[PDB]
């Protein structure tokens, strides 16, 4: 809402497309940019306003980038957790945090392509009352 | 006694110590039980005094470390000359220096940096530099890119050559201690060869290469027609036509008929009207005179032939009535502590760097420098800040010498011991001066600010109202204008037109003109002295009270760098010699940030501007400095609010990054206030609760996390506080003049 | 070699004579005897000032002190104060100067009523100064400061205002 | 000042002024009854924040009123 | 030996620097060809 | 009626501080309270 | 002025008494048959609250504590 | 108190008006050799061959000096407290043994038989004049 219209009907978007300001080395990068942003909704400024409501029509605004992060983010955290727990079994744990043991890390880094499958499998994520409880309350 | 003694194969060159971190220290070599080990690894990497109790190993590390540093500076310089060759408009600037801006960078055509590649003239789209290397290389006579290309390669070869030296010396051929302690041999060699012969050889350049090339180029001949430097040596007819003094040859030199060389060794004492800059012949006569002085000055000391002084002898003789033994024992401290040497060298080299900037603006020593107002402020502002940093370092190491290397046996009733024994009188009186000035320097601004708001403009301290004229400076100014006639009569023009004379006009721009001094200029000079005095109060107190105090008598055993003693005694917070330096940096800033504005606003208002052929000068801000620089609101209105319009409006232009850099610094600045205002006690408790969450999900780290140390928190803040401050006015200075 | 190098150790050298000494004979004490602090000229001047002069009553001291300050404080208010360019410029200085004397006398009697600890002894004045160690002495000093201060300002007003007639 | 610079630097500075006043000849007559010491650690925090807050208040007030009043919206 | 050199790269800064350079190069090189992607286009 | 401000302003700025500070100083410096 | 309290978890390191600048602490014999010694705080007027002893005691939490209280010339470390 | 003062020209840092009015201190020690030692407050001084004496403002300066004397292997450092009336008390060692080495004559004081965690809550002792640590 808020006086939000499609692009082509909006005169502001039609004017900004002329002033290209080509980003990349390609001469037609500016024209290709504005043509691609024709799909989005444009306000009085002509700048596209993205709707992150959750509409399947506007899924590319937030929904598709959103899933792309969490798959990557869980890859990073799940790899760091498994590498950290693996170090704990070895003798000198503090040194491996600094000087990484690639024999342990790189196999673990290879995994994580399916972290949710492993995550749901571990219903015991190490949580107990045996942790740092730290004066009485 | 000054013989060369060298140990052979001191240490191997194995790569295993790289894998072993913290090898240099014993405690760190054990292991990283906590995160503070990581921060301590960096804070002790260069502190060789802590690694070993052996002075010889410390000296060898230092001598080799300097060589690796010169590699960095040479690589930085070799890249500078390289960018001038490939990514630059130098060849176009040479033909049309006034109407073409200097650029040396090309941002790539990616996400949208390309707007930064603005039209700087000469068919080149790039960032407009302000270092002034275009003016430097022109004075060097570099008229083509290949001459510029070859010089870059030599620096890299020179860089690796320095790098090979530190390897050769630390691993293979280590000098012993007695080689380093020969200070008398060091001073002679550096004075005569490094400073003396280096100046003499550079005069060979000015006489053979630069001045003929410059004398041709400013005369109207194109760079295409200018011969190369080698042709002057082979063919003397071209040189004799420009400088007829060479027809006599070298015979007038040895026969003391030095008047024959007056054509190309002048004492004009002024700027060249064509190119805003000092005469090249005056710079040739310059270095030749100074080289003889340096060559002569270096034979003072003895060095194995019985002819020369012992510095120990001279110092011991300079005792007096008030100073019991005078300078007895200083030679031992200077020869037994690297920190004392670093303190003297930093303190005066920093004061030297400040003295350069004051000279370079009034008498531009390069061609086409004053017309480039962008370069002058950036060149002035840069060195002014560098010297301030180094002076503070001189006080820090002065305290480190005390806590570490001060021996009471050596310093017995000498000039130093006698200073420590009355430290209270030195500081108490300096405390009085800082309070005296701060009232009568800043209070006058408040009185003017109060009166102008009250509607009483006749009660202010101003030029029309009550006026405080700097008669002593006006007095000294008048002498230098009248000097070329009577005192030092051989000079034709006054030394600098800043003192007085006439307006010099290069193109439409004014290069330099007399800087009149009034009540407003009176009102700022003392503000520097006031801020400088407080900076000395903080730093000087750090040196004297580092060993002991009435509050703490055992401050030496704790060390130079400790946060406190404890809560009691009312509180022992920031009592160390380190913490004094931490506070002095804020005052080193406030001392310095006003200096660059006093230069920036005045020159825009009184000196820099455009001049008409009739003789009427239209300055940039139109004399607003006279009446507005006597109130704090005028600085806020006419200097900060007004001149910053180009920065905020820089978006969508080539200067748009300055608007970003002007702003990102403000974030980094306030980010400093986290670490200065806060304390570790809060942060470790917060980290404790966060550690529980990781224990819950079994993501607990092996190296147990710890908050930053107390001294580090103060350190990280002042690092941000300064970086956010300097980076802010850095972009404001750039974008203002780059538009204006 | 020059003889100046050989004589550096001898006590006959003019260098080796030391001007600075410990406060009294005890070096543990704070002060240091200096030509500014312990010279006969400075000692005579300070010890014979009204605050330290021997054989004077507390009232006589404040009168000498007040007459000086009253005569001094007239200047800043007249020439540099407001209404400095007007017929009544000198008159404003007389009132403002007497104003400080009242405030100054208030602080004196106010400091007096609060039990003053002591009057300290230093190198420049070895003996204790006077009977300024009691409320009675300080109170008489305050009343004397008021009389002299009002008189001194009037004197500076009379001379300054009637200077042209004196010329 | 009170937030950044902490006590131990200041109390040392105070000891010097105490030395001077006790050793200045004419000012030896007048002396404090209560010994002057630096502000405590918690006191300086209080004094510092009150300054940080008062300036935060008066500054925006003058901008809030004058910007709106001079233009009258 | 070679083992001593490999552990130097295994340390945190060199391991972080090499990995983080590759991460930055991938994003920089993607924005080169595919200039600007505010949203995924909609089939 | 405007003459009241000419009498009330100075006593607030001068008389009241002098009376308060003078009493408070002697009160805090008193040995027995 | 201050109050230095010594708790049961001492083991006789003798580190507290050494770190004290003003000699507020002292090691005394304990009536424990197998306990070698224990610290003490006999002259508490001279405590200057610098908390060096709290840094020296190696127990998991400190057997010795220094609770701040009424100040004086000695506790505030005023030579003047 | 009997001893020779160490030889030093003097210093601004030292005894002040507190010494006359309030409890000046004095340290005594005997030296085997005349040596240069740093003073507690600024400068250096030469101790005499035997029975040195130095007047001191605060007790902290004396014990801080004693730690320096132990570097020169002088362990017979004695401190006194001098009131304005001249009362001198053997203050630092009450008995000849040092504080570090145990002696039967001493007695424990301010000993809390409870552990530190077993201290009562302050709400239990409010409006009573009692303190938690007591
Ligand atoms: C030729 C290769 C080589 C090799 C194998 C060694 C090997 C060794 N050197 Mg050595 N050295 C060399 C060249 C070499 N050096 C050269 C060329 C110099 C002259 C500068 C020195 C000077 C030197 C000194 C003075 C010392 C050593 C020491 C050592 C030992 C420990 C070093 C260590 O673990 O830290 C490894 C550390 C690093 C790899 C980091 C170094 C970073 C470089 C030098 C600077 C980079 C600056 C950079 C531009 C800053 C950018 C900042 C910003 C972008 C973030 C080890 C046996 C030390 C020793 O023996 O200890 C007792 C010692 O004190 N060396
Ligand atoms: C002070 C040292 C210094 C600095 C800050 C720079 C900075 C720069 N150089 Mg450079 N350069 C230097 C020294 C330096 N140079 C020296 C000594 C040489 C000669 C050996 C060169 C030779 C050189 C070339 C040949 C090129 C640059 C380029 C560049 C730019 C891109 C850097 C890049 O892509 O990184 C990449 C970083 C990693 C791969 C890691 C950048 C402005 C490029 C440029 O400006 O293109 C327009 C380019 O093509 N430089
Ligand atoms: C010739 C110059 C010089 C030299 C050789 C030294 C040498 C030394 N200093 Mg020193 N110092 C200097 C100048 C110098 N200083 C100046 C100018 C100052 C005033 C600012 C100081 C202030 C100072 C203090 C306060 C201390 C030292 C200490 C030391 C010693 C250990 C430092 C250490 O471990 O290094 C490693 C140092 C670091 C890792 C600090 C990194 C700081 C970074 C570079 C700040 C960021 C600046 C950067 C430009 C920002 C932009 C880039 C960034 C955003 C990426 C060592 C002997 C220490 C000591 O106790 O000596 C025994 C100490 O506590 N110095
Ligand atoms: C704007 C902020 C500010 C101000 C005004 C001050 C002021 C001062 N600092 Mg300072 N300081 C600050 C920020 C500031 N600091 C910060 C942020 C830091 C941390 C880095 C420090 C760290 C610091 C140190 C480490 C030191 C100082 C010192 C000083 C003093 C220098 C003496 C002087 O200028 O004469 C006093 C001048 C003024 C106070 C200026 C304004 C006075 C006007 C003209 C008069 C007021 C009018 C009237 C009388 C008001 C009466 C009102 C009535 C109703 C009651 C002074 C009290 C030094 C010091 O105390 O030694 C002398 C010192 O060593 N400061
Ligand atoms: C600290 C800096 C400073 C200075 C130098 C002045 C100076 C002045 N102010 Mg001002 N003012 C200041 C700060 C300052 N102001 C601030 C911060 C404010 C804001 C609160 C104001 C607000 C203000 C107002 C509102 C007014 C003034 C006015 C005046 C003028 C009259 C002064 C007067 O009557 O006092 C009289 C002064 C004295 C009685 C004593 C001065 C001290 C003497 C000279 C000391 C000498 C010591 C001596 C050398 C040592 C001897 C050594 C011994 C051994 C012999 C004068 C020009 C008035 C005016 O209209 O201006 C024209 C006025 O109405 N002021
Ligand atoms: C502040 C005093 C002062 C200073 C700094 C100078 C400085 C200088 N004089 Mg000079 N001069 C002075 C007073 C001074 N003069 C007086 C009072 C006289 C008497 C008229 C002279 C007469 C004089 C002569 C005759 C010459 C100099 C020259 C010089 C220059 C080189 C001198 C060498 O050594 C130098 C710039 C020489 C020169 O040519 O100046 C460039 C030279 O030949 N001076
Ligand atoms: C809140 C933080 C935040 C967020 C959410 C974003 C998000 C975005 N930025 Mg942005 N940016 C940020 C911080 C952030 N940035 C910062 C700190 C800066 C510098 C100060 C920038 C500077 C910046 C610029 C200059 C540009 C973006 C662009 C973009 C968009 C496209 C990036 C892209 O192509 O994905 C990467 C592409 C993929 C296909 C994903 C691949 C995933 C992995 C690597 C594959 C394996 C995206 C919406 C671009 C834009 O606006 O395009 C419309 C653009 O040109 N950003
Ligand atoms: C007065 C000039 C110093 C004259 C001077 O220093 O005298 C120098 C005088 C000389 O004593 P000696 O002959 O023993 O010095 C022999 C030298 O070889 C030892 O360095 O010594 C003193 O009187 C000590 C006084 C120092 C303290 C004097 C006050 C300094 C004030 C601060 C500086 C003000 C600078 C203002 C101008 C920029
Ligand atoms: C050189 C010198 C100097 C200087 C000096 C001076 C400058 C002085 C001061 C001056 C002064 C400061 C003076 C004043 C005087 C005053 C007077 C002259 C007074 C008068 C008074 C009167 C006469 C009064 C009376 C009266 C009375 C009391 C009451 C009633 C009224 C009548 C009025 C009657 C000095 C010392 C610093 C230092 C050394 C050297
Ligand atoms: C914030 C703050 C802290 C806490 C600050 C901390 C803990 C800074 C931590 C900085 C880094 C981000 C910690 C983690 C570094 C990791 C190695 C980074 C991950 C590696 C990837 C980035 C590659 C203090 O300890 C402190 C102490 C005294 C006065 C003020 C303060 C203060 O203000
Ligand atoms: C300046 C400063 C001092 C010295 C400041 C002192 C001694 C205060 C001096 C101020 C005098 C008393 C004048 C102040 C007058 C006020 C304008 C009014 C206060 C009165 C109210 C009670 C009404 C500290 O003691 C200190 C301690 C810990 C951290 C930082 C600092 C610190 O920054
Ligand atoms: S636990 Fe503490 S108090 Fe007990 S002996 Fe050890 S250091 Fe002393
Ligand atoms: S605070 Fe600690 S170290 Fe200081 S006197 Fe008291 S017990 Fe001893």
Swiss-Prot record, chain A:
<feature type="transmembrane region" description="Helical">
    <location>
        <begin position="59"/>
        <end position="79"/>
    </location>
</feature>
<dbReference type="GO" id="GO:0031676">
    <property type="term" value="C:plasma membrane-derived thylakoid membrane"/>
</dbReference>
<keyword id="KW-0602">Photosynthesis</keyword>
<keyword id="KW-0472">Membrane</keyword>
<keyword id="KW-1133">Transmembrane helix</keyword>
<comment type="similarity">
    <text>Belongs to the PsaF family.</text>
</comment>
<dbReference type="GO" id="GO:0009538">
    <property type="term" value="C:photosystem I reaction center"/>
</dbReference>
<keyword id="KW-0603">Photosystem I</keyword>
<feature type="transmembrane region" description="Helical">
    <location>
        <begin position="100"/>
        <end position="120"/>
    </location>
</feature>
<comment type="subunit">
    <text>The cyanobacterial PSI reaction center is composed of one copy each of PsaA,B,C,D,E,F,I,J,K,L,M and X, and forms dimeric and tetrameric complexes.</text>
</comment>
<keyword id="KW-0812">Transmembrane</keyword>
<protein>
    <recommendedName>
        <fullName>Photosystem I reaction center subunit III</fullName>
    </recommendedName>
</protein>
UniProtKB/Swiss-Prot annotation, chain B:
<feature type="transmembrane region" description="Helical; Name=VII">
    <location>
        <begin position="425"/>
        <end position="447"/>
    </location>
</feature>
<feature type="binding site" description="axial binding residue">
    <location>
        <position position="666"/>
    </location>
    <ligand>
        <name>chlorophyll a'</name>
    </ligand>
</feature>
<feature type="transmembrane region" description="Helical; Name=VI">
    <location>
        <begin position="377"/>
        <end position="403"/>
    </location>
</feature>
<dbReference type="GO" id="GO:0031676">
    <property type="term" value="C:plasma membrane-derived thylakoid membrane"/>
</dbReference>
<keyword id="KW-0460">Magnesium</keyword>
<keyword id="KW-0793">Thylakoid</keyword>
<feature type="transmembrane region" description="Helical; Name=IV">
    <location>
        <begin position="283"/>
        <end position="301"/>
    </location>
</feature>
<keyword id="KW-0602">Photosynthesis</keyword>
<dbReference type="InterPro" id="IPR001280">
    <property type="entry name" value="PSI_PsaA/B"/>
</dbReference>
<feature type="transmembrane region" description="Helical; Name=III">
    <location>
        <begin position="187"/>
        <end position="211"/>
    </location>
</feature>
<dbReference type="GO" id="GO:0000287">
    <property type="term" value="F:magnesium ion binding"/>
</dbReference>
<keyword id="KW-0249">Electron transport</keyword>
UniProtKB/Swiss-Prot annotation, chain G:
<feature type="binding site">
    <location>
        <position position="47"/>
    </location>
    <ligand>
        <name>[4Fe-4S] cluster 2</name>
    </ligand>
</feature>
<dbReference type="GO" id="GO:0046872">
    <property type="term" value="F:metal ion binding"/>
</dbReference>
<feature type="binding site">
    <location>
        <position position="16"/>
    </location>
    <ligand>
        <name>[4Fe-4S] cluster 1</name>
    </ligand>
</feature>
<keyword id="KW-0677">Repeat</keyword>
<feature type="binding site">
    <location>
        <position position="20"/>
    </location>
    <ligand>
        <name>[4Fe-4S] cluster 2</name>
    </ligand>
</feature>
<feature type="domain" description="4Fe-4S ferredoxin-type 1">
    <location>
        <begin position="1"/>
        <end position="30"/>
    </location>
</feature>
<dbReference type="GO" id="GO:0009522">
    <property type="term" value="C:photosystem I"/>
</dbReference>
<protein>
    <recommendedName>
        <fullName>Photosystem I iron-sulfur center</fullName>
        <ecNumber>1.97.1.12</ecNumber>
    </recommendedName>
</protein>
<dbReference type="InterPro" id="IPR017491">
    <property type="entry name" value="PSI_PsaC"/>
</dbReference>
<keyword id="KW-0560">Oxidoreductase</keyword>
<keyword id="KW-0411">Iron-sulfur</keyword>
<dbReference type="InterPro" id="IPR050157">
    <property type="entry name" value="PSI_iron-sulfur_center"/>
</dbReference>
UniProtKB/Swiss-Prot annotation, chain H:
<dbReference type="Pfam" id="PF02531">
    <property type="entry name" value="PsaD"/>
</dbReference>
<keyword id="KW-0793">Thylakoid</keyword>
<protein>
    <recommendedName>
        <fullName>Photosystem I reaction center subunit II</fullName>
    </recommendedName>
</protein>
<dbReference type="GO" id="GO:0009538">
    <property type="term" value="C:photosystem I reaction center"/>
</dbReference>
<keyword id="KW-0602">Photosynthesis</keyword>
<keyword id="KW-0472">Membrane</keyword>
<comment type="subunit">
    <text>The cyanobacterial PSI reaction center is composed of one copy each of PsaA,B,C,D,E,F,I,J,K,L,M and X, and forms dimeric and tetrameric complexes.</text>
</comment>
<dbReference type="InterPro" id="IPR036579">
    <property type="entry name" value="PsaD_sf"/>
</dbReference>
<dbReference type="InterPro" id="IPR003685">
    <property type="entry name" value="PsaD"/>
</dbReference>
<comment type="function">
    <text>PsaD can form complexes with ferredoxin and ferredoxin-oxidoreductase in photosystem I (PS I) reaction center.</text>
</comment>
<keyword id="KW-0603">Photosystem I</keyword>
<comment type="similarity">
    <text>Belongs to the PsaD family.</text>
</comment>
